[PDB]
Coordinates of C-alpha atoms and ligand atoms in Angstrom, one line a residue:
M1 CA 92.2 110.0 121.2
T2 CA 94.4 108.4 118.6
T3 CA 93.7 104.7 117.9
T4 CA 96.4 103.0 115.8
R5 CA 96.0 100.0 113.6
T6 CA 98.5 97.2 113.4
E7 CA 98.1 94.2 111.0
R8 CA 99.0 90.7 112.0
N9 CA 98.2 87.1 111.0
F10 CA 97.9 83.6 112.4
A11 CA 97.5 80.1 111.0
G12 CA 93.8 79.2 111.3
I13 CA 92.2 75.8 111.0
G14 CA 93.3 74.0 107.9
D15 CA 96.5 76.2 107.9
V16 CA 94.6 79.0 106.3
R17 CA 96.3 82.4 106.8
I18 CA 94.0 84.6 108.9
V19 CA 94.8 88.3 108.8
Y20 CA 93.6 90.5 111.7
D21 CA 93.8 94.1 112.8
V22 CA 94.6 95.3 116.3
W23 CA 93.4 98.8 117.2
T24 CA 95.2 100.3 120.1
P25 CA 94.3 103.7 121.7
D26 CA 96.8 106.0 123.4
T27 CA 95.3 105.4 126.8
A28 CA 95.4 102.7 129.4
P29 CA 93.6 99.6 128.1
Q30 CA 90.3 99.3 129.9
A31 CA 89.2 96.1 128.1
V32 CA 89.7 94.1 124.9
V33 CA 87.1 93.6 122.1
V34 CA 87.3 90.7 119.7
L35 CA 85.1 91.5 116.7
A36 CA 83.6 89.2 114.0
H37 CA 82.3 90.7 110.8
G38 CA 79.6 89.2 108.6
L39 CA 79.0 87.4 105.3
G40 CA 81.0 88.7 102.4
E41 CA 82.5 91.7 104.2
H42 CA 85.8 92.1 106.1
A43 CA 87.3 93.9 109.2
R44 CA 88.2 97.1 107.4
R45 CA 84.5 98.0 107.2
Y46 CA 84.8 98.4 111.0
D47 CA 87.5 101.1 111.2
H48 CA 85.1 103.7 112.6
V49 CA 83.7 101.2 115.2
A50 CA 87.2 100.4 116.4
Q51 CA 88.1 104.1 116.5
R52 CA 85.0 104.8 118.7
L53 CA 85.7 101.9 121.0
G54 CA 89.3 103.1 121.3
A55 CA 88.1 106.6 122.3
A56 CA 86.5 104.7 125.3
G57 CA 89.8 103.0 126.1
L58 CA 89.1 99.6 124.4
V59 CA 91.6 97.6 122.3
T60 CA 89.9 96.0 119.3
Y61 CA 91.1 92.8 117.6
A62 CA 89.2 92.1 114.3
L63 CA 89.9 89.2 112.0
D64 CA 89.0 88.7 108.3
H65 CA 87.3 85.3 108.4
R66 CA 88.6 82.6 106.2
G67 CA 87.5 83.3 102.6
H68 CA 87.1 87.0 103.3
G69 CA 89.1 90.1 102.9
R70 CA 92.8 89.7 103.2
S71 CA 92.7 86.2 104.7
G72 CA 93.3 83.0 102.7
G73 CA 90.9 80.3 101.7
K74 CA 88.4 79.9 98.9
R75 CA 86.1 82.9 98.9
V76 CA 83.1 82.5 101.2
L77 CA 83.8 78.8 101.7
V78 CA 83.1 77.0 105.0
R79 CA 82.2 73.4 105.7
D80 CA 81.2 73.7 109.4
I81 CA 80.4 76.5 111.9
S82 CA 83.3 75.2 113.9
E83 CA 85.8 76.5 111.4
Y84 CA 84.7 80.1 112.1
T85 CA 84.4 79.6 115.9
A86 CA 87.8 77.9 116.0
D87 CA 89.6 80.9 114.4
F88 CA 87.6 83.3 116.5
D89 CA 88.7 81.3 119.6
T90 CA 92.3 81.6 118.4
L91 CA 91.9 85.4 118.2
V92 CA 90.3 85.5 121.7
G93 CA 93.4 83.6 123.0
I94 CA 95.8 86.1 121.4
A95 CA 94.0 89.0 123.0
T96 CA 93.8 87.3 126.3
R97 CA 97.5 86.6 126.4
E98 CA 98.4 90.1 125.3
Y99 CA 96.1 91.8 127.9
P100 CA 95.8 89.3 130.7
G101 CA 94.4 91.8 133.2
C102 CA 91.6 93.0 130.9
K103 CA 87.9 92.1 130.6
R104 CA 87.1 90.5 127.3
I105 CA 84.2 91.6 125.1
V106 CA 83.1 89.5 122.1
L107 CA 81.2 91.5 119.4
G108 CA 79.7 90.2 116.1
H109 CA 77.4 91.5 113.3
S110 CA 75.0 89.4 111.3
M111 CA 76.8 86.2 110.3
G112 CA 79.5 87.3 112.7
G113 CA 76.8 87.6 115.4
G114 CA 75.9 84.0 114.7
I115 CA 79.6 83.0 115.0
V116 CA 79.9 85.0 118.3
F117 CA 76.7 83.4 119.7
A118 CA 77.9 79.9 118.7
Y119 CA 81.3 80.7 120.3
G120 CA 79.7 81.9 123.5
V121 CA 77.4 78.9 124.1
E122 CA 80.4 76.6 123.6
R123 CA 82.7 78.7 125.9
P124 CA 80.3 80.6 128.2
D125 CA 83.1 81.2 130.8
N126 CA 85.7 82.5 128.3
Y127 CA 84.5 86.1 127.9
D128 CA 83.0 88.8 130.1
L129 CA 80.5 90.7 127.8
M130 CA 78.8 90.0 124.5
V131 CA 77.5 92.5 122.0
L132 CA 75.5 91.4 118.9
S133 CA 74.4 93.5 115.9
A134 CA 71.5 91.9 114.1
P135 CA 72.8 88.4 114.9
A136 CA 72.1 85.6 112.4
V137 CA 70.7 83.2 115.0
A138 CA 67.5 82.1 113.2
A139 CA 68.6 81.4 109.6
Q140 CA 66.0 78.7 109.2
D141 CA 63.3 81.5 109.4
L142 CA 65.1 83.5 106.6
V143 CA 65.4 81.0 103.8
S144 CA 62.8 78.9 102.0
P145 CA 62.5 75.2 102.8
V146 CA 64.0 74.4 99.4
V147 CA 67.1 76.5 100.1
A148 CA 67.4 75.0 103.6
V149 CA 67.4 71.5 102.2
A150 CA 70.0 72.4 99.5
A151 CA 72.2 74.0 102.0
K152 CA 71.9 71.2 104.6
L153 CA 72.5 68.4 102.1
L154 CA 75.2 70.1 100.0
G155 CA 77.0 72.5 102.3
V156 CA 79.8 70.0 103.2
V157 CA 80.4 68.5 99.8
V158 CA 79.8 71.6 97.6
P159 CA 80.2 74.4 100.0
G160 CA 80.6 77.0 97.3
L161 CA 77.3 76.2 95.5
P162 CA 75.2 79.4 95.4
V163 CA 71.9 79.0 97.2
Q164 CA 70.4 82.4 98.1
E165 CA 70.4 86.0 96.7
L166 CA 71.4 88.8 99.0
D167 CA 69.7 92.2 98.5
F168 CA 72.7 94.5 99.1
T169 CA 70.4 97.5 98.9
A170 CA 69.0 96.4 102.3
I171 CA 72.3 96.7 104.1
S172 CA 71.9 100.5 104.8
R173 CA 69.6 103.3 103.9
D174 CA 72.7 105.5 103.2
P175 CA 73.3 105.1 99.5
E176 CA 77.0 105.8 100.0
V177 CA 77.3 102.8 102.3
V178 CA 75.6 100.6 99.7
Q179 CA 77.9 102.1 97.0
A180 CA 81.1 101.6 99.0
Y181 CA 80.1 97.9 99.6
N182 CA 79.3 97.3 96.0
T183 CA 82.6 98.8 94.7
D184 CA 84.9 97.2 97.3
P185 CA 87.0 94.6 95.6
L186 CA 87.4 92.7 98.8
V187 CA 83.6 92.2 99.3
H188 CA 81.9 89.1 97.9
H189 CA 79.5 90.3 95.2
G190 CA 77.9 86.9 94.5
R191 CA 75.2 84.9 96.2
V192 CA 75.1 83.2 99.6
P193 CA 76.8 79.8 99.3
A194 CA 75.6 76.4 100.6
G195 CA 78.4 76.0 103.2
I196 CA 77.7 79.3 105.0
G197 CA 74.0 78.6 104.7
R198 CA 74.5 75.2 106.4
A199 CA 76.8 76.7 109.1
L200 CA 74.2 79.3 110.0
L201 CA 71.4 76.7 110.0
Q202 CA 73.6 74.8 112.5
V203 CA 73.4 77.8 114.8
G204 CA 69.7 78.6 114.2
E205 CA 68.2 75.2 114.5
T206 CA 69.2 74.9 118.1
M207 CA 69.4 78.5 119.3
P208 CA 66.5 78.2 121.8
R209 CA 68.0 75.1 123.4
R210 CA 71.6 76.4 123.5
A211 CA 71.0 80.1 124.5
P212 CA 70.3 79.1 128.1
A213 CA 74.0 78.4 128.4
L214 CA 74.8 82.0 128.2
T215 CA 75.5 83.4 131.5
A216 CA 77.4 86.7 130.8
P217 CA 75.7 90.0 130.0
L218 CA 74.4 90.5 126.5
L219 CA 73.5 93.6 124.4
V220 CA 71.7 93.1 121.1
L221 CA 71.2 95.9 118.6
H222 CA 68.7 95.8 115.8
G223 CA 67.2 98.2 113.3
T224 CA 63.4 97.9 113.1
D225 CA 63.4 98.2 109.3
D226 CA 66.0 95.5 108.8
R227 CA 64.8 93.5 105.8
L228 CA 67.7 91.1 105.8
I229 CA 67.2 89.7 109.3
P230 CA 63.8 90.5 110.8
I231 CA 64.0 92.2 114.3
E232 CA 61.6 89.6 115.8
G233 CA 64.4 87.1 115.7
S234 CA 66.5 89.2 118.2
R235 CA 63.4 89.6 120.3
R236 CA 63.2 85.8 120.4
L237 CA 67.0 85.5 121.2
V238 CA 66.8 87.7 124.2
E239 CA 63.9 85.6 125.6
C240 CA 66.0 82.4 125.3
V241 CA 69.3 83.4 126.8
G242 CA 70.1 82.5 130.3
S243 CA 71.7 85.7 131.5
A244 CA 69.6 88.1 133.5
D245 CA 71.6 91.1 132.2
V246 CA 70.2 91.0 128.7
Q247 CA 68.9 93.9 126.6
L248 CA 67.7 94.5 123.1
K249 CA 68.1 98.0 121.8
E250 CA 65.7 98.6 118.9
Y251 CA 66.5 101.5 116.5
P252 CA 63.3 102.8 114.8
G253 CA 63.7 103.0 111.0
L254 CA 67.3 101.6 110.8
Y255 CA 68.3 99.1 108.2
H256 CA 70.5 96.0 108.8
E257 CA 74.0 97.5 109.4
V258 CA 73.2 99.7 112.4
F259 CA 76.9 100.5 112.8
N260 CA 76.9 102.0 109.3
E261 CA 73.6 103.8 109.4
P262 CA 73.3 107.6 109.6
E263 CA 72.6 107.2 113.3
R264 CA 75.7 105.1 113.9
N265 CA 77.2 107.6 116.3
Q266 CA 74.2 107.2 118.6
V267 CA 74.3 103.4 118.2
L268 CA 78.0 103.4 119.1
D269 CA 77.5 105.8 122.1
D270 CA 74.9 103.3 123.3
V271 CA 77.3 100.4 123.0
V272 CA 80.1 102.3 124.7
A273 CA 77.8 103.3 127.6
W274 CA 76.6 99.7 128.1
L275 CA 80.1 98.3 128.0
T276 CA 81.8 100.9 130.1
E277 CA 79.5 100.6 133.1
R278 CA 80.0 96.8 133.1
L279 CA 83.8 96.7 133.2
Ligands
7WW301 C1 67.0 86.6 102.4 O1 68.3 86.8 102.0 C2 69.3 87.0 102.9 C3 69.1 87.2 104.3 C4 70.2 87.3 105.1 C5 71.5 87.3 104.6 N1 72.6 87.3 105.5 N2 73.3 88.4 105.6 C6 74.4 88.1 106.4 C7 75.5 89.0 106.8 O2 76.3 88.6 107.6 N3 75.6 90.2 106.3 C8 74.7 90.9 105.3 C9 75.6 91.9 104.7 C10 76.5 92.3 105.8 O3 75.9 93.3 106.6 C11 76.7 91.0 106.6 C12 74.3 86.8 106.8 C13 73.2 86.3 106.2 C14 72.7 84.8 106.1 C15 71.4 84.5 105.7 C16 71.1 83.1 105.6 C17 72.0 82.1 105.8 C18 73.3 82.5 106.1 C19 73.7 83.8 106.3 CL1 75.3 84.1 106.6 C20 71.7 87.1 103.3 C21 70.6 87.0 102.4

């Protein structure tokens, strides 16, 4: 298979320029995937994911969120989760109009998994399948009470205020992945800001009450040795969602970024097998 990338943009909320990739395989389109990356990264850390999904006949749309990658906006700035979910919704609409006969898959990693979850509970009828990699759906369990207060009280007025260190050595146990993250000029190399912290707290604080609104099938992927987001949070998520077709795949010994781990091809084969049979 050859899966070709085309780069496009749209005006996001606040008239921020949002850049996105579309990855199109040279086969009949079996479904569309709308993909949300996580904190401080960007959609070009997902080329290999899009290429594997294309080998299965899937067209992948992947945006750089505001404040990330090639998109506009102050770096890592957000004042409400709805900014991220609104731009994600715009991308879902573009994909839906371009491929109106196709099933729609929403996929997110980490912060992006929080965004996709938040999207899905708001629009539970507007997608067919959800896939989450280590989703940030319990941020209140990951930061100290002091950090949570600071983020909650300051994340609208001073959204760029740094509140929390991120241990980038925890993203992957492949040192080349860590090095490529640290040397990427489009990655955020500073601390977690108050605005993103607040936005993720908005998702986490009510996850158990909102997750019952999910109805569509869900696959969650999580490495057991993830020190950034503990795996027990994904175990709790799958107990709270409404949908009967829900599965957590735990990967023994993997770090946070399961799609970038040495075992990534097995992880991705699992994702493709789960998706394909549900189309
Ligand atoms: C204890 O320290 C930390 C624990 C988790 C994270 N965290 N990482 C991501 C994330 O999206 N990525 C990590 C690198 C790449 O794989 C994508 C999101 C978060 C997160 C955490 C709290 C509030 C808000 C957020 Cl957004 C950061 C520091």
